[PDB]
Design a protein around this motif. Structure first.
Motif, PDB file in Angstrom:
ATOM      1  N   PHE D   1      19.548 -47.174 -31.177  1.00 56.70           N
ATOM      2  CA  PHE D   1      19.366 -46.648 -29.994  1.00 56.70           C
ATOM      3  C   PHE D   1      19.868 -45.381 -29.651  1.00 56.70           C
ATOM      4  CE2 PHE D   1      19.209 -51.475 -29.313  1.00 56.70           C
ATOM      5  CZ  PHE D   1      18.366 -51.617 -29.906  1.00 56.70           C
ATOM      6  N   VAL D   2      19.456 -44.277 -28.721  1.00 62.00           N
ATOM      7  CA  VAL D   2      19.951 -43.024 -28.381  1.00 62.00           C
ATOM      8  C   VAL D   2      20.311 -43.145 -27.049  1.00 62.00           C
ATOM      9  CG1 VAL D   2      18.235 -41.910 -30.262  1.00 62.00           C
ATOM     10  CG2 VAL D   2      17.545 -42.223 -27.765  1.00 62.00           C
ATOM     11  N   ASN D   3      21.229 -42.039 -26.681  1.00 63.09           N
ATOM     12  CA  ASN D   3      21.449 -42.007 -25.351  1.00 63.09           C
ATOM     13  C   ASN D   3      20.428 -41.510 -24.663  1.00 63.09           C
ATOM     14  OD1 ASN D   3      24.397 -42.873 -25.508  1.00 63.09           O
ATOM     15  ND2 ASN D   3      24.541 -40.823 -26.837  1.00 63.09           N
ATOM     16  N   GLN D   4      20.350 -41.844 -23.298  1.00 60.91           N
ATOM     17  CA  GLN D   4      19.021 -41.511 -22.715  1.00 60.91           C
ATOM     18  C   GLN D   4      19.449 -41.018 -21.211  1.00 60.91           C
ATOM     19  OE1 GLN D   4      15.729 -41.180 -22.974  1.00 60.91           O
ATOM     20  NE2 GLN D   4      15.828 -42.166 -25.221  1.00 60.91           N
ATOM     21  N   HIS D   5      18.499 -39.826 -20.998  1.00 59.47           N
ATOM     22  CA  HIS D   5      18.648 -39.305 -19.596  1.00 59.47           C
ATOM     23  C   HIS D   5      17.345 -39.948 -18.393  1.00 59.47           C
ATOM     24  CE1 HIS D   5      18.442 -35.399 -16.947  1.00 59.47           C
ATOM     25  NE2 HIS D   5      19.152 -36.385 -16.379  1.00 59.47           N
ATOM     26  N   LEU D   6      17.793 -40.599 -17.724  1.00 59.85           N
ATOM     27  CA  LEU D   6      17.009 -41.487 -16.678  1.00 59.85           C
ATOM     28  C   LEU D   6      17.211 -41.419 -15.358  1.00 59.85           C
ATOM     29  CD1 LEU D   6      17.338 -44.615 -19.234  1.00 59.85           C
ATOM     30  CD2 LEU D   6      15.451 -43.089 -19.335  1.00 59.85           C
ATOM     31  N   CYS D   7      16.004 -40.719 -14.660  1.00 62.61           N
ATOM     32  CA  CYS D   7      16.337 -40.625 -13.208  1.00 62.61           C
ATOM     33  C   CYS D   7      15.175 -41.556 -12.732  1.00 62.61           C
ATOM     34  CB  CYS D   7      16.346 -39.281 -12.653  1.00 62.61           C
ATOM     35  SG  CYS D   7      17.605 -38.213 -13.348  1.00 62.61           S
ATOM     36  N   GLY D   8      15.509 -42.145 -11.564  1.00 62.10           N
ATOM     37  CA  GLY D   8      14.500 -42.661 -10.642  1.00 62.10           C
ATOM     38  C   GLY D   8      13.472 -43.667 -11.308  1.00 62.10           C
ATOM     39  N   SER D   9      12.366 -43.707 -11.390  1.00 61.82           N
ATOM     40  CA  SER D   9      11.473 -44.609 -11.788  1.00 61.82           C
ATOM     41  C   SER D   9      11.515 -44.957 -13.099  1.00 61.82           C
ATOM     42  CB  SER D   9      10.038 -44.310 -11.396  1.00 61.82           C
ATOM     43  OG  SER D   9       9.627 -42.941 -11.692  1.00 61.82           O
ATOM     44  N   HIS D  10      12.123 -43.657 -13.838  1.00 56.94           N
ATOM     45  CA  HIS D  10      12.326 -43.938 -15.229  1.00 56.94           C
ATOM     46  C   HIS D  10      13.376 -44.912 -15.563  1.00 56.94           C
ATOM     47  CE1 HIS D  10       9.102 -41.091 -16.169  1.00 56.94           C
ATOM     48  NE2 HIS D  10       9.784 -40.080 -15.416  1.00 56.94           N
ATOM     49  N   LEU D  11      14.566 -44.974 -14.982  1.00 57.39           N
ATOM     50  CA  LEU D  11      15.557 -45.789 -14.938  1.00 57.39           C
ATOM     51  C   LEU D  11      15.063 -46.992 -14.960  1.00 57.39           C
ATOM     52  CD1 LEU D  11      18.418 -46.752 -15.430  1.00 57.39           C
ATOM     53  CD2 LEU D  11      18.993 -45.997 -13.076  1.00 57.39           C
ATOM     54  N   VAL D  12      14.315 -47.448 -13.932  1.00 63.49           N
ATOM     55  CA  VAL D  12      14.043 -48.830 -13.608  1.00 63.49           C
ATOM     56  C   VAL D  12      13.025 -49.358 -14.776  1.00 63.49           C
ATOM     57  CG1 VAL D  12      14.273 -48.741 -11.092  1.00 63.49           C
ATOM     58  CG2 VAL D  12      12.058 -48.300 -12.084  1.00 63.49           C
ATOM     59  N   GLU D  13      12.238 -48.470 -15.104  1.00 66.34           N
ATOM     60  CA  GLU D  13      11.408 -48.834 -16.330  1.00 66.34           C
ATOM     61  C   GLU D  13      12.349 -49.184 -17.486  1.00 66.34           C
ATOM     62  OE1 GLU D  13       8.535 -45.230 -16.198  1.00 66.34           O
ATOM     63  OE2 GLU D  13       6.825 -46.888 -16.583  1.00 66.34           O
ATOM     64  N   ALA D  14      13.309 -48.516 -17.857  1.00 66.87           N
ATOM     65  CA  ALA D  14      14.254 -48.773 -18.953  1.00 66.87           C
ATOM     66  C   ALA D  14      14.879 -50.183 -18.663  1.00 66.87           C
ATOM     67  CB  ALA D  14      15.385 -47.665 -18.978  1.00 66.87           C
ATOM     68  N   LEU D  15      15.400 -50.297 -17.526  1.00 63.60           N
ATOM     69  CA  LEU D  15      15.840 -51.866 -17.131  1.00 63.60           C
ATOM     70  C   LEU D  15      15.093 -52.763 -17.500  1.00 63.60           C
ATOM     71  CD1 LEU D  15      17.965 -50.794 -13.853  1.00 63.60           C
ATOM     72  CD2 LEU D  15      18.770 -51.677 -15.966  1.00 63.60           C
ATOM     73  N   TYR D  16      13.716 -52.571 -16.996  1.00 59.36           N
ATOM     74  CA  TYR D  16      12.794 -53.392 -17.293  1.00 59.36           C
ATOM     75  C   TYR D  16      12.697 -54.013 -18.716  1.00 59.36           C
ATOM     76  CZ  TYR D  16       8.385 -56.168 -17.644  1.00 59.36           C
ATOM     77  OH  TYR D  16       7.238 -56.967 -18.021  1.00 59.36           O
ATOM     78  N   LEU D  17      12.794 -52.843 -19.697  1.00 58.63           N
ATOM     79  CA  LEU D  17      12.511 -52.967 -20.997  1.00 58.63           C
ATOM     80  C   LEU D  17      13.639 -53.736 -21.617  1.00 58.63           C
ATOM     81  CD1 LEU D  17      10.772 -49.570 -21.883  1.00 58.63           C
ATOM     82  CD2 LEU D  17       9.655 -51.879 -22.179  1.00 58.63           C
ATOM     83  N   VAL D  18      14.759 -53.177 -21.357  1.00 59.78           N
ATOM     84  CA  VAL D  18      16.243 -53.967 -21.758  1.00 59.78           C
ATOM     85  C   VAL D  18      16.245 -55.297 -21.121  1.00 59.78           C
ATOM     86  CG1 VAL D  18      18.671 -53.606 -21.608  1.00 59.78           C
ATOM     87  CG2 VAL D  18      17.213 -51.566 -21.847  1.00 59.78           C
ATOM     88  N   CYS D  19      15.972 -55.544 -19.885  1.00 57.43           N
ATOM     89  CA  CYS D  19      16.247 -56.768 -19.505  1.00 57.43           C
ATOM     90  C   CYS D  19      15.133 -57.763 -19.752  1.00 57.43           C
ATOM     91  CB  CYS D  19      16.720 -56.856 -17.992  1.00 57.43           C
ATOM     92  SG  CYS D  19      18.187 -55.864 -17.804  1.00 57.43           S
ATOM     93  N   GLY D  20      13.880 -57.394 -19.602  1.00 57.13           N
ATOM     94  CA  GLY D  20      12.820 -58.322 -19.752  1.00 57.13           C
ATOM     95  C   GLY D  20      12.689 -59.460 -18.871  1.00 57.13           C
TER      96      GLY D  20
END
Ligand SMILES: [Cl-]
Ligand SMILES: [Cl-]
Ligand SMILES: [Zn+2]
Ligand SMILES: [Zn+2]
Lengths: 29, 28, 21, 29, 21, 28, 21, 29, 28, 21, 21, 21
Positions: D1-20
């Motif tokens: 996994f890489v470090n990510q730059h994530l704002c707004g809706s992109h952050l919540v997409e990432a949380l969805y993918l990680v947390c499931g």
């Protein structure tokens, strides 16, 4: 089609839409 | 684990891979 | 491929890393 | 996994993918 | 916090794991 | 009204809730 | 929960507000 | 509902969510 | 060619049309 | 309409251009 | 390349076609 | 208009309602 300004996840969405089932390579510099 | 399909699959690839780049190949 | 493992079946983010360049 | 730059809706997409199916809390400061 | 770190700076998926149930 | 599922459900939560924050809990 | 009300069934943005912090 | 900062594809996502099956017009200046 | 539905259909419209604008009308 | 041509059936980006203003 | 062109500047869908299989 | 307001500034979902059919 118009010229598009596409960064990050937006660029890969565009590649998905253009390439479809053909698939694609994402290769940043 | 989740089902990741189409545009959702490639956004997950972007997330995981980032500036490493990735390949999306349905035919494989 | 990826579609079979991750879309048809399910896969982890670790499995997804296998498609990184 | 890489470090990510994530704002707004992109952050919540990432949380969805990680947390499931585990779910997640979105809590901005 | 990590949320703001992600947007002003960078963050890891590992850090985001801290927000799961 | 529409069906909102997975990543689409959380983006709708972001939209509606914004900097109030939100919880996404399938198990609930 | 939210999945039953909004994904399985349908829901309004008003219903969605019930999951705000 | 909160006030939102929405550019490009994010704006049309929001219109989709608000308008639903009613449909919508996207008309930039 | 792919199936483009809902939010995915309008993002494809944005892509293709851009600042030309577009209409999304399911009832049509 | 668009839903029938592009969602129910499939369509090209060229077909999508028909819905531009 | 075209990738960076897209983000720093603008690019066409035609240019993106160069990345398909 | 409201479109440009959304991106340069902020806008409400109520304002966006003005663009529905
Ligand atoms: Cl963005
Ligand atoms: Cl979907
Ligand atoms: Zn974005
Ligand atoms: Zn989707």
């Amino acid at each position: 089609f118009v010229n598009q300004h596409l960064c990050g996840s937006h660029l890969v969405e565009a590649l998905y839409l253009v390439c479809g089932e053909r698939g694609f390579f994402y290769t940043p510099k």
